[PDB]
Design a protein around this ligand. Structure first.
Ligand SMILES: *[C@@H]1O[C@H](CO[C@H]2O[C@@H](C)[C@@H](O)[C@@H](O)[C@@H]2O)[C@@H](O[C@@H]2O[C@H](CO)[C@@H](O[C@@H]3O[C@H](CO)[C@@H](O)[C@H](O)[C@@H]3O)[C@H](O)[C@H]2NC(C)=O)[C@H](O)[C@H]1NC(C)=O
Ligand SMILES: *[C@@H]1O[C@H](CO[C@H]2O[C@@H](C)[C@@H](O)[C@@H](O)[C@@H]2O)[C@@H](O[C@@H]2O[C@H](CO)[C@@H](O[C@@H]3O[C@H](CO)[C@@H](O)[C@H](O)[C@@H]3O)[C@H](O)[C@H]2NC(C)=O)[C@H](O)[C@H]1NC(C)=O
Ligand SMILES: *[C@@H]1O[C@H](CO[C@H]2O[C@@H](C)[C@@H](O)[C@@H](O)[C@@H]2O)[C@@H](O[C@@H]2O[C@H](CO)[C@@H](O[C@@H]3O[C@H](CO)[C@@H](O)[C@H](O)[C@@H]3O)[C@H](O)[C@H]2NC(C)=O)[C@H](O)[C@H]1NC(C)=O
Ligand SMILES: *[C@@H]1O[C@H](CO[C@H]2O[C@@H](C)[C@@H](O)[C@@H](O)[C@@H]2O)[C@@H](O[C@@H]2O[C@H](CO)[C@@H](O[C@@H]3O[C@H](CO)[C@@H](O)[C@H](O)[C@@H]3O)[C@H](O)[C@H]2NC(C)=O)[C@H](O)[C@H]1NC(C)=O
Ligand SMILES: *[C@@H]1O[C@H](CO)[C@@H](O[C@@H]2O[C@H](CO)[C@@H](O)[C@H](O)[C@H]2NC(C)=O)[C@H](O)[C@H]1NC(C)=O
Ligand SMILES: *[C@@H]1O[C@H](CO)[C@@H](O[C@@H]2O[C@H](CO)[C@@H](O)[C@H](O)[C@H]2NC(C)=O)[C@H](O)[C@H]1NC(C)=O
Ligand SMILES: *[C@@H]1O[C@H](CO)[C@@H](O[C@@H]2O[C@H](CO)[C@@H](O)[C@H](O)[C@H]2NC(C)=O)[C@H](O)[C@H]1NC(C)=O
Ligand SMILES: *[C@@H]1O[C@H](CO)[C@@H](O[C@@H]2O[C@H](CO)[C@@H](O)[C@H](O)[C@H]2NC(C)=O)[C@H](O)[C@H]1NC(C)=O
Ligand SMILES: *[C@@H]1O[C@H](CO)[C@@H](O[C@@H]2O[C@H](CO)[C@@H](O)[C@H](O)[C@H]2NC(C)=O)[C@H](O)[C@H]1NC(C)=O
Ligand SMILES: *[C@@H]1O[C@H](CO)[C@@H](O[C@@H]2O[C@H](CO)[C@@H](O)[C@H](O)[C@H]2NC(C)=O)[C@H](O)[C@H]1NC(C)=O
Ligand SMILES: *[C@@H]1O[C@H](CO)[C@@H](O[C@@H]2O[C@H](CO)[C@@H](O)[C@H](O)[C@H]2NC(C)=O)[C@H](O)[C@H]1NC(C)=O
Ligand SMILES: *[C@@H]1O[C@H](CO)[C@@H](O[C@@H]2O[C@H](CO)[C@@H](O)[C@H](O)[C@H]2NC(C)=O)[C@H](O)[C@H]1NC(C)=O
Ligand SMILES: CC(=O)Nc1ccc(C(=O)O)cc1NC(=O)C[NH3+]
Ligand SMILES: CC(=O)Nc1ccc(C(=O)O)cc1NC(=O)C[NH3+]
Ligand SMILES: CC(=O)Nc1ccc(C(=O)O)cc1NC(=O)C[NH3+]
Ligand SMILES: CC(=O)Nc1ccc(C(=O)O)cc1NC(=O)C[NH3+]
Ligand SMILES: [Ca+2]
Ligand SMILES: [Ca+2]
Ligand SMILES: [Ca+2]
Ligand SMILES: [Ca+2]
Lengths: 388, 388, 388, 388
């Protein structure tokens, strides 16, 4: 077993082909399936596994009541193979409410976070044993990537933030190799609030399209240099730019430099990636809520400030449907490394009222160089059918 | 791991011995088991796995209502080992309503199809990652083999059709090696409507006994040359010839050349195979419906037009029982490659009315050179016992 | 992987130590667990697996009604590891109502029998594929060992009988190597009715303590020579001799030669083994029914006709409890090959009336050279608790 | 595969980081999960597995009624990977009410105990087969470690006691290598009643912090020499000393030599470990009951009699919550061997009355050299939600 490093050109994609779905909510109406949220997937050198943060209970349990709450001690990192849902025999990889996982080539890595909001502990597990841990550095809800981290040449990198969500915070990028932290570096560059980074490998470094939860609808970029521990911020030029809440497409701005101050506050985890001066990107269909999902390439979306010219769009989830979080995950090809993405479709309480629980299901597509068609692959759970 | 190529003489069989059954419907009355249809099996160099197209739900679910519909986004390729039914921990290999799977020796291949009837995408997955994809080429429900494809010397071949079911259509045979499409060839020869091909390897090529859904009760043959990408049609000489609806055994014709124009329209996926001038073949017992199943060798059924002389018959499912789809699957012996076959036994709605769902179970036999006996191995689900 | 041959001295045992139990019935009252009967276990070079003949249904199913019947098409060979019960994800190894399984060293072997009582087929599966098959030879319920077969030097041997249960029958001993039958030999020696043989390896041959279901309470012996295909009968000298029904211990006879004609008819599968002139043996506690179980060595029980002198007894199941079938299974030690045994504890219909199903659970002990204590490890299912 | 021996310096810890939890009780309210108690975990060279003594039944079973009883024949050693709970497909490793398991490097070892209180049998299983067994030596409930045993250089060691709980007893330390007992040695030194030893490897020997159930609140030490078979007793100097019932922290004594005679009788399995003259140790928060849990290092707690000076405390379970048994388990690092610990959280009958069953769940932390935070990770099962 050699170490991962990703020195292959990114695959020239043409859109996204259908790749997987797990129907968690439908099956939850007839079967013992876990209550989760905040999902993600990450492929080890051999196969893709699907993660999520389960709430120490199953859906048709009485314990499902009030799962809208994000943090509880009885929360853990569920992990199965991609395709197989989170049933009663799923292992619980660690105690956690915030997470991230990667695979350096040799073995896994799971940064699991539990504890109180004021003082928390992030445990670093690698190869199955616990190797290190870190304390909160600002006493306000220490959180992490919420998706797959990336390891180049034996060294994994996960960005982490602790401070206030809608107010400035303290973010740093830890370089943790073999489960052991061998460096920490704070944020540098023009970004105002970095939360929930979707990070992909781009030789010889790492890139992150994150979540400004305080000042902007535009998305912060974070650039990590694995050979130097140097950090850099920016923003996505895309005039089309998409977080949620969002302003409007003809009234949205971005200069690639600083928050657009357009409904900035609040948001959702998202993703995007470059191709020269072009930017492939996902977004919910709506500016106001997390309903439906759409992908498209924005011409000059990576190098020209405020470019709002799009080519190649695909509806992933129909506008009359729910979505939520989402992140990108990349996988090595035998020639180039492709980039795929997952999309969490949340059902239940707060939005939906018949029921008192909150859980999600997933869908996932992958970049293709070939031709494709059309559709809308959503949840499919009649709320009147579902228990509670 | 070397590549498959199948350069062994086909085993001289004498009938079919009992091999497997999975009791899916019975167990569905007491346990969380998936709703499926369109099953099939395919043996990797080591063991046989059983596939099916599950409808994003379990049987004793409220989501089971109205599963007679063939296509929905919440449809996926379930896959377990042969014998173990599709329970709540079965992985969902991909999103799909139409499918096919093979194993080139090194790894698997799954051509999964989803999307709209007017524009669909067939995703090609190999070794776990997504390698290519293809768009619909005629805007009318792009479909595929519905059983195992065959790979000789590193190159897999799946025939595919898109166009109208009862009217002519556009069929081609794609040669897709390593998940990557490296050729496409359209249909050639005398066949009028090729759907649902049961294809087996016959060195140094591939043969397919399919489904003429528009003009004939006789079954179309398709011949693929792996070394040339050349195609050829014919029809099965068997005067006995069997699709469904079928005309009558004393009133059925076939000239090995073109549709018999005897109740031609509509049909069902089926199978058959040669042995010199002889043809071993399965068929439902009835001309009108898919009830019961029978196998037998037709003397001169492969080389003499309209031969209706049969030797060696076996009742697989009693005439007072249900059947449906069926396909052949072959497996290499340590001397010759045998040919086995599966039979889908569908229960539920449309035919059966007490319940509102549609699902199947399976049985499967294998060619033998030894002696055998008698029986009728069907479903076994008292509809009055079953939920809904 | 080399072939098994067993050229090690049998371990000098001193009684039986506790080894495993699977609580199938208790767990069946709260969980989806299979309905079975006729269990057995067999250790592959690495670990012990537990088999049984499940009735195509789960216990808290409505299909469980009337499972007292021994034969149905919807019957299969369930197989899990020893300890893990037969839950909804257990694979069904083949279609069968009568069975046997062994492991030649390289891979498994399962002689599975289905079909009609008048004409049946015994399918021979090895290494996962189907290699051969055999037809009934007398038109009256073709049956086999019902426990593990034994393979010495690449050649497996399973004894088989077809004919009437309580009247004479046609028994032969087939030598089936690599799934392929390479010889058959009929019965020889003094035995009158051989059914359900418990066969263990005794270099350089095989020995079987069976079930005379027509003329005797004494148990028939069967001796197979792997190097010659020669057969030999006898009977167990033990005056203590135990089948069921049995006569009485002070009124029981055996001359090691022919049926004692003492309640002879009917019986149950059982086991025993030699040690010089001594015979270790299991038996139900009662002469009339299958209730409780006891083991003990009978001094001179192997070489002296009618010896009824016992030393070293152990109650395995209390007299106020149920038992049933049982067989011996041996396992290689790093110095000598030990001999263990399983005991089927049947509950439900015929005997018990509250419920309408029939199923069993198991317990299993193993020979020890060390010291031991005392107990009674039975089922534990309150019939008033159980469903139906 | 080489043998374990543990010749690495113990890792200098700084407290305990969060490592795992399995939410068994919550999930038991919606799903088929086992009833257990007396849990523990033990890491094989590759991954950690979690053990427990299940009561031959599931929680929402009617058989769960009256599981407060410690011993029944229908009791077995459940074993899954750490994280995955004990669901219906968990294997039952052996019949047992008292247990211990270790891994010599090559394979496992399970000392399983069943039988009557007056005469019992402890079966020794290694590599899957049964190798030896031992009889009770005093006719009064033969018991063992109840946690992981330790094997240095091919030889495993489990301490064992048989005699009266609250009165003196007969304890010895058996050295059982390859499943075979190759020595036994009785207790030596100053200890009065040794029960439930938590034993960790400390090159080149083994150390055990046990349970004086008759004369003291202080905890007995047991020292085993693997190269000599020599034993030695002591007591923990910690004035803070903690068993339950306990006296009071300002009124508790210990001289490292003999029982403090302070509420001595009764107790609970516990743990502790040295670091020079310092002693890291767990304890329930309360002197009277098993509620809540706390860890801390006691300055001079290993070498100075009656030292009650503590530094570095952590609340693991809040004082308003339940705990119970607990043991230490160590795992090798790539530089030093760390020490972790598990904590059983029992719910149900005796204490809790709404329900009639008794079962536990678990939490588990691991030593860290890094920084940490704060919390209380308990069960989380609303007793009003739970069945029965
Ligand atoms: C789900 O929970 C809600 C409130 O959330 C918490 O409730 C706790 C106790 C627990 O479930 C935990 O999981 C959640 O964090 C329950 O809502 C209350 O239900 C009663 C039902 O009667 C409402 O009506 C009034 O209640 C009293 C008893 O409380 C009755 O005498 C009368 O009916 C009275 O009219 C009450 O106003 C509800 N409160 C809120 C804030 O909505 C809910 O019942 C539960 N539901 C389900 C389906 O599981
Ligand atoms: C299964 O579904 C049928 C119709 O199929 C769809 O129904 C939707 C809503 C959903 O289940 C989806 O899965 C299917 O695609 C249901 O049939 C209708 O049921 C009512 C029951 O009352 C019939 O009677 C009349 O209905 C109204 C309410 O609709 C009542 O006030 C009166 O009883 C009235 O007489 C109605 O005519 C049915 N329609 C059809 C086309 O048959 C069915 O109930 C459902 N069944 C089960 C057992 O799951
Ligand atoms: C289990 O089955 C028995 C008989 O065995 C078969 O039954 C079939 C239909 C199916 O279950 C299959 O699995 C078995 O091979 C059932 O017994 C009969 O039950 C009725 C119940 O009412 C008895 O009473 C009389 O029956 C009629 C309807 O049949 C009613 O109007 C009246 O109550 C009437 O008094 C009948 O005499 C029973 N027959 C026998 C031979 O015992 C049984 O009900 C079923 N039980 C359970 C708990 O699953
Ligand atoms: C759980 O068990 C208790 C007692 O424990 C044992 O019970 C056996 C039979 C079995 O469950 C085994 O698992 C346990 O070791 C049951 O308690 C008794 O229940 C009755 C219920 O009615 C109480 O009231 C009186 O009982 C008679 C019938 O026994 C009725 O006519 C009247 O109601 C009468 O007032 C009785 O006093 C209880 N005994 C004790 C010692 O508490 C319990 O019912 C059962 N419960 C559950 C929820 O599973
Ligand atoms: C990235 O990893 C691969 C794995 O070794 C390194 O390149 C391969 O390594 C050898 C020789 O370099 C052979 O496996 C192939 O020639 C290389 N590629 C592949 C796909 O096999 C590569 O050197 C590493 N990257 C860097 C920048 O050092
Ligand atoms: C990943 O590994 C390669 C493999 O060694 C690194 O490339 C080497 O760089 C060092 C000095 O920095 C040289 O000694 C080697 O000769 C270079 N390459 C190879 C293929 O040998 C590369 O820097 C690493 N990547 C990162 C991001 O640190
Ligand atoms: C089909 O595959 C086999 C796998 O290699 C090729 O034949 C075997 O290969 C070698 C030498 O040819 C040995 O494994 C045996 O002599 C061959 N057969 C078997 C069953 O082992 C074979 O050459 C391939 N077919 C063709 C037409 O090239
Ligand atoms: C499968 O592989 C064999 C193995 O090479 C092919 O047979 C060879 O054909 C080429 C030229 O076509 C020759 O160079 C080889 O010498 C031939 N055989 C062998 C055993 O070496 C065969 O064509 C392939 N089958 C198909 C259907 O393409
Ligand atoms: C039975 O099988 C074993 C497996 O090979 C044969 O004996 C072993 O084989 C070699 C050399 O004979 C070594 O593995 C050991 O010396 C033998 N025993 C063991 C336990 O390892 C043995 O020869 C076979 N029996 C006969 C009768 O030929
Ligand atoms: C099991 O195998 C051994 C291993 O060969 C057999 O013993 C050999 O017998 C042949 C002639 O019968 C000789 O050529 C060998 O030299 C003998 N033994 C060995 C260890 O080489 C033995 O017969 C076989 N057992 C059975 C029951 O057939
Ligand atoms: C404990 O086990 C290890 C496993 O072999 C022994 O030390 C290692 O063994 C070799 C040479 O000694 C190499 O694997 C490393 O140098 C050693 N340590 C490790 C972590 O790999 C060691 O000798 C054994 N202990 C004793 C006391 O003999
Ligand atoms: C564990 O194993 C080592 C490895 O051999 C033991 O150390 C050896 O002791 C013997 C004599 O007692 C010497 O022959 C070796 O040369 C010593 N060490 C090594 C690394 O070779 C050690 O005693 C064993 N541990 C225990 C607790 O018994
Ligand atoms: C730790 C935690 O609660 N994470 C969240 C989960 C969901 C969630 C959400 O959007 O529902 C918000 C959360 N907060 C953040 O991630 C802050 N960036
Ligand atoms: C895509 C799709 O719906 N496939 C079918 C499934 C079943 C089905 C059937 O016969 O029930 C028919 C289908 N149509 C075709 O296969 C056309 N050849
Ligand atoms: C084929 C079949 O029915 N086997 C039996 C099962 C159980 C059974 C029994 O004893 O319940 C009897 C059977 N008959 C035989 O084995 C004849 N020796
Ligand atoms: C064999 C057995 O019953 N073990 C116990 C389990 C639990 C238990 C307890 O504390 O609930 C006590 C037991 N007795 C002992 O361990 C004596 N040290
Ligand atoms: Ca925002
Ligand atoms: Ca037709
Ligand atoms: Ca008899
Ligand atoms: Ca005490």
């Amino acid at each position: 077993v050699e170490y991962r490093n990703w020195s292959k050109p990114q695959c020239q994609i043409t859109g996204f082909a259908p790749f997987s779905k797990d129907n968690s909510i439908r099956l939850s109406a007839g079967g013992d399936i876990w209550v989760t949220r905040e999902p993600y997937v990450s492929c080890d050198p051999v196969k893709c596994y699907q993660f999520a943060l389960g709430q120490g209970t199953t859906l048709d349990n009485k314990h499902s009541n009030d799962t809208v709450h994000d943090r509880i001690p009885h929360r853990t990192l569920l992990m199965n193979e991609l395709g197989v849902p989170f049933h009663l025999g799923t292992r619980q990889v660690c105690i956690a409410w915030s997470s991230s996982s990667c695979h350096d080539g040799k073995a896994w890595l799971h940064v699991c976070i539990t504890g109180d909001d004021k003082n928390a502990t992030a445990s670093f597990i690698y190869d199955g044993r616990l190797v290190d841990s870190i304390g909160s550095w600002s006493q306000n809800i220490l959180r992490t990537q919420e998706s797959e981290c990336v390891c180049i040449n034996g060294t994994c990198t996960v960005v982490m933030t602790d401070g206030s969500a809608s107010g400035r915070a303290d973010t740093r990028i830890l370089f943790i190799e073999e489960g052991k932290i061998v460096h920490i570096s704070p944020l540098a560059g023009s970004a105002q609030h970095v939360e929930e980074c979707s990070c992909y490998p781009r030789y010889p470094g790492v890139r992150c399209i994150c979540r400004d939860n305080w000042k902007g609808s535009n998305r912060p970029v974070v650039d990590i240099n694995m050979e130097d521990y140097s950090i850099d911020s920016s923003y996505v030029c895309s005039g089309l730019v998409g977080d949620t809440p969002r302003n409007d497409d003809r009234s949205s701005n971005s200069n690639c430099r600083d928050p657009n101050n357009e409904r900035g506050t609040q948001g959702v985890k998202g993703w995007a990636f470059d191709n020269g001066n072009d930017l492939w990107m996902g977004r919910t269909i709506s500016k106001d809520l997390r309903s439906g999902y759409e992908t498209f390439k924005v011409i000059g979306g990576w190098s020209t400030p405020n470019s709002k010219s799009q080519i190649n769009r695909q509806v992933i989830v129909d506008s009359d449907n729910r979505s939520g979080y989402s992140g990108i995950f990349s996988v090595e090809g035998k020639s180039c490394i492709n980039r795929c993405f997952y999309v969490e479709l949340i059902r239940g309480r707060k939005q939906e009222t018949r029921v008192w629980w909150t859980s999600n299901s997933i869908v996932v597509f992958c970049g293709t160089s070939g031709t494709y068609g059309t559709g809308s692959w959503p949840d499919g759970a009649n709320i009147n059918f579902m228990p509670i």
